[PDB]
Design a protein around this ligand. Sequence first.
Ligand code: NAP
Ligand code: NAP
Ligand code: 4NO
Ligand code: 4NO
Ligand code: NA
Ligand code: NA
Ligand code: NA
Lengths: 357, 347
Amino acid sequence: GYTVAVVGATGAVGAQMIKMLEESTLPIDKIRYLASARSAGKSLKFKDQDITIEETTETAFEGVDIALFSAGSSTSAKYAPYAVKAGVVVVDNTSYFRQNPDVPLVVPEVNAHALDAHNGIIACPNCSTIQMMVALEPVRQKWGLDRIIVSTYQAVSGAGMGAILETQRELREVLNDGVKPCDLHAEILPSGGDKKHYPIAFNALPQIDVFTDNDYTYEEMKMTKETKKIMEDDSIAVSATCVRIPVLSAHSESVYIETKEVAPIEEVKAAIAAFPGAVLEDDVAHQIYPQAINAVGSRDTFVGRIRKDLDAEKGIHMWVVSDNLLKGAAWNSVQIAETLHERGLVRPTAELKFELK
Amino acid sequence: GYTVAVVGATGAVGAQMIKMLEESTLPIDKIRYLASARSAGKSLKFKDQDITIEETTETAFEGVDIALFSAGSSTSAKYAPYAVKAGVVVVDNTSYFRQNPDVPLVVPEVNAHALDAHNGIIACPNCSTIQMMVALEPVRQKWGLDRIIVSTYQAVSGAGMGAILETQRELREVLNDGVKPCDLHAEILPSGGDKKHYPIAFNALPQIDVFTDNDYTYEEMKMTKETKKIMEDDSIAVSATCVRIPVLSAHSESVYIETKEVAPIEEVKAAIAAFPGAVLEDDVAHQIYPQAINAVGSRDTFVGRIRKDLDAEKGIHMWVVSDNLLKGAAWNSVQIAETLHERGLVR
Ligand SMILES: NC(=O)c1ccc[n+]([C@@H]2O[C@H](COP(=O)([O-])OP(=O)(O)OC[C@H]3O[C@@H](n4cnc5c(N)ncnc54)[C@H](OP(=O)(O)O)[C@@H]3O)[C@@H](O)[C@H]2O)c1
Ligand SMILES: NC(=O)c1ccc[n+]([C@@H]2O[C@H](COP(=O)([O-])OP(=O)(O)OC[C@H]3O[C@@H](n4cnc5c(N)ncnc54)[C@H](OP(=O)(O)O)[C@@H]3O)[C@@H](O)[C@H]2O)c1
Ligand SMILES: O=C(O)c1ccc([N+](=O)[O-])cc1P(=O)(O)O
Ligand SMILES: O=C(O)c1ccc([N+](=O)[O-])cc1P(=O)(O)O
Ligand code: NA
Ligand code: NA
Ligand code: NA
C-alpha cells in the first residue's frame, strides 16, 4: 500500500480530503496529516485511528508516496518542490502550478491521458472550472466548442474555514440581532488577500480572488486559461464573471456555449447523461433542475436547464451545480490519486523540474 | 391635485408605492388604498394621516384620476378594464398588459415618448428588465445593440412579502436549529403559482415564474420580449437565465452585450455615467463595483465591472444592480405617474 500525506488537513478542503481518502479505493498503509506549526502536535481522526498533525517542512515528506496539497498556493510553492525532490507524487489543489507546462492539469473524466507525462506534480483545476469541464466535455467531443460565456454563483467554503464562519456570523447578526447588512463588519470576503472586505450576508459580490491587469479577476482568468489547457484547445473563447453568493457549499453556474456544429438539444441532454461524473437533472415539466442544496455531499456534477439560445443557431444555455469541496476539490484530487495508482504512475520522478524556494 | 388609488397597498410593492408617493412631486389631493376583502377595514398611513383600506371592486374606481396596480396579474386583468371605463389612468405593475399593442411599456429614461400614445393603461416592465434597460440604453444610443445574454441574481422580495418571510424563517432554521438546507419546508418559492416549492436558504433556484413551452421561464421570456418593445427594435437578440438567490432586496445581473460598432470601454463608462438614472461605480483598483446591500433604498441603477470580452471584438460584460422594489417596481411606476402629470397626459 501507500503512505499518503494530506497537506492542509485542518482546513475546509483538508477535512473533505480526509473523508474522500477514508472512502477511497487507494490501498493506504500509512496516513500523515500536515498543517502549520500551530496545528502540529494536535490530533485528528483517520477512520478510528488518532493521527498526530505534523508541521509542513522541507523534510516532512520522507517515505511519502503521494501527497495531496490543499493549504493555499504559497504552501504549495514552498513545499511541493521539496516533496517531489523526496520522491513523492504531489496532487496539488492550488492555482500555483496549474499553468506550468511540465504539470498535467487534470479532470480524470476529461483528460486522464495527460497524467502519463507527469513530472511529480499533478494540478487539480479551480473548483468552478472542474464542474464546467465535466458538463461540457461530452458536448465538445461530439459537436465541438467555439466559445463559452459563464456567470458563476459561488459558495463561500471555497474561501476557507474562516470565510464559512464569517458568513455564518454575519447572517446571525442580521437575523438574530437586527444588524443591517450594510452595517456588518467583514474581515475576509471577497478576498482574504485583498485590501478591503465586504459583507456577504444577503449580498452578491462580483469579486473572487484579486483583480488582474485586464480588469477580470484571477478567478475569471483561471476559468479561461484552465479550460484551454484541460480541453487542449487554445481556440476556445472563454470569458467569465465570478460572483460570491450566500451559499456555504456547492457552486452553481449559468453556462452559455456555442458549438462548432449544431447540436440537437435532446442529444446534448443525452450526451451529458451518458458522460461519467455528469448527471442530467432536467425535467422542467416537473421543475427538476440542479440545486446547490441537493448537490452537497455528492461527487457527481448536475446539469439542467439545457435549452437552445433564442437566436444563435449554435448557442446553448445550461445550469451546472457541484459540491465545490468534493468534485471541485477533494474528490477531484482523490480521483486523480486513484487514477495514478490504477495506471502505474505512482513512482518517484527521475529529474527535478521545479524551482526550490 | 389628483385622487390617487394604490391597488395592492398592503403588499411588498404596495408598501414601496406608498413610500414613493409620499416622496413624490405628484400633487395629491386624495389618496386611497385598495387591496383584497381580507385587508379591507384595516388602517395604513399616508404620511401622518390614517387611510382605510378598501376592497377592490368593479365600482370602487369612481372619482379616481390615477390608479397604480400592484396586486398581481389576475387583479389587473379583472379590475383595470373597469377603472379605464370609469376614466381612470391606470399604471400597471403586472405582466398582464405588457405585450398589448395598445399599451405603452415604459421606462421613463428610455421611452417616455411612448406615453403620448396611451389609451388609459400604461404598463411598468418587469423589475429585472427595467434596470437592464437603464444600463444599456446609453450604449444602444451610441454604438447599437446586436445581442444581449443575461444571467440574473434576483432578490426574494420580487416574489412578495410571503417570500421574504419564508426566506428569513428558513435561514434561522438552518443557523439556529441546525436544520440541513435540503430538509427545509417551503411553501412559496421558486413560484407561488407552480406545483412544487423549494428552499431558497443557502441555495440558488434557476426558476423565476413558471415554465413556458420553449423551456425558458416566463421571467426569462419577459426580459426578451420587454427589451424588444421598450427599445422598439425586434432585431435585438435577447436570451436570459433568471435565478433567485438569498438576497432580500436588490437584483444583480451579469450582462453580456455585443454592440453594432466597437465601443471603446472608457467611452462606454462615460456614456453610462452621463445617462440619467444610471450611476457608474467602477474602480477595480479600489474594489469598487455595484453591490446589492448598498443599492437598497436608492432609486438609481448602479453599473460596474465594465470590460471588453476577451475574444469578441464587439462584446462587453458588465454588472448591474438596483433595488427591485424601487426602480424595479414602485419608483418606475411613480416616475411614470409624475411623467404623465408633467406632460399633461392625466386625461
Ligand atoms: N483566526 C481566526 O479568527 C480563525 C477563523 C477561522 C478559522 N481559524 C482556524 O485557523 C486555521 C486557518 O483558517 P483558514 O480559514 O485559513 O482554514 P482553511 O483556509 O480552510 O485551510 C487552510 C489550511 O492551510 C493550512 N496552512 C496555513 N498556513 C500554513 C503553513 N505555513 N504551512 C502549512 N499549512 C498551512 C492550515 O493549517 P492550520 O490549521 O495549521 O493553520 C489549514 O490546514 C483553520 O484550521 C481554522 O481552524 C481561525
Ligand atoms: N389582514 C389579514 O388578516 C390578511 C390575511 C391574509 C392575507 N393578507 C394579505 O395578503 C398578502 C399575502 O402576501 P403576498 O406575499 O401575497 O403579498 P404580495 O405579493 O407582497 O402583495 C400582494 C398584494 O396584492 C393584493 N391582492 C391579492 N389579491 C387581491 C384581489 N383579489 N383584489 C385586490 N387586491 C389583491 C394583496 O392584498 P391583501 O393584503 O388584501 O391580500 C396585496 O396588497 C399580505 O401582504 C397580507 O397583507 C392579510
Ligand atoms: O484559487 C484556487 O483555485 C485555489 C483552490 C484551492 C486551494 N486549496 O488550497 O484547496 C487553493 C487555491 P489558491 O491558489 O491558494 O487560491
Ligand atoms: O411578473 C411580473 O413581472 C410582476 C411584477 C410585479 C407585479 N406586481 O403586482 O407589482 C406582478 C407581476 P405578475 O405579472 O403578477 O407576475
Ligand atoms: Na453521466
Ligand atoms: Na494498472
Ligand atoms: Na441583432
